[PDB]
């Protein structure tokens, strides 16, 4: 399964250079965009964390957490563990954690180099809804660079806001000595 992704990442993300590093972000962001298209997500935050890890936060419905008859596993686990790019991001990260905010509960699971740490667990109560995915790209895969380009991300985030008119989407850099944030929103009929 995902071991094939770790051994031939070039076949899944096109490059293991800086281009592939940035592709990981879009693979997660695209899923949040799909949930905006479904009509439920209204805002997406992309964050470059101080350690060059990535957090993507949306306010959609939250990935389904119920057990599937075909797998006997929660749907959210399958999203990240079965090879449509979320599992690819998981495989090529040292760690990925998902929090699903749904029906008053926060459901949490984490993976390490693609492998499950523990069963999905309720860790908190919540009044919000959505999905938060955080990942640390694997330097064993991204041997050229693990350092993100804020302008590169910002440029595409702006493009995505335009193509998805009505969406709120932001990009934030939390790295030392260069903290920045840009927020984008193109108006619909209310304009
Ligand atoms: C933060 C990134 C994110 N946000 C996400 N938000 C949702 S919300 C959602 C999507 N589809 C549904 N279909 C049926 C019922 N509930 C749904 C909720 N789903 C997700 N899935 C599900 C399948 C795959 N596209 C990933 C994601 C993902 Cl990944």
Ranges of each domain in the chain: 1-191
Ligand 1 centre distance from Cα of residue 11 (Å): 24
Which DSSP letter does residue 67 get?
B
CATH number of 1-191: 3.30.565.10
For a pocket test of ligand 1, which of 29, 35, 79 has the largest count of ligand atoms closer than 8 A to its C-beta? 35
What DSSP designation does 17 have?
S
Identify any residues that bridge with 136 across adjacent strands, giving them in sequence order: 95
* Structure determined by: X-ray
Task: Name the resolution in angstroms.
Answer: 1.7
């Amino acid at each position: 399964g995902l071991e094939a992704v770790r051994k031939r990442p070039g076949m899944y993300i096109g490059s293991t250079s800086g281009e592939g590093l940035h592709h990981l972000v879009w693979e997660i962001v695209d899923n949040s965009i799909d949930e905006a298209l479904a009509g439920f997500a209204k805002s997406i935050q992309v964050i470059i964390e101080p350690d060059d890890s990535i957090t993507v936060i949306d306010d959609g419905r939250g990935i389904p957490v119920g057990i599937q008859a075909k797998t006997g596993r929660p749907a959210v686990e399958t999203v990240f563990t079965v090879l449509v790019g979320s599992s690819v991001v998981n495989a090529l990260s040292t760690s990925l954690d998902v929090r699903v905010y749904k029906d008053g509960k926060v459901y949490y699971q984490e993976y390490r180099r693609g492998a499950v740490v523990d069963d999905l667990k309720v860790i908190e109560e919540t009044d919000r809804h959505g999905t938060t995915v955080h990942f640390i790209p694997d330097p064993e895969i991204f041997t050229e660079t693990t350092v993100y380009d804020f302008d590169k991300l910002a440029t595409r985030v702006r493009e995505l806001a335009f193509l998805n008119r009505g969406l709120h989407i932001s990009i934030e850099d939390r790295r030392e000595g260069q903290e920045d944030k840009k927020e984008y929103h193109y108006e619909g009929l209310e304009h």
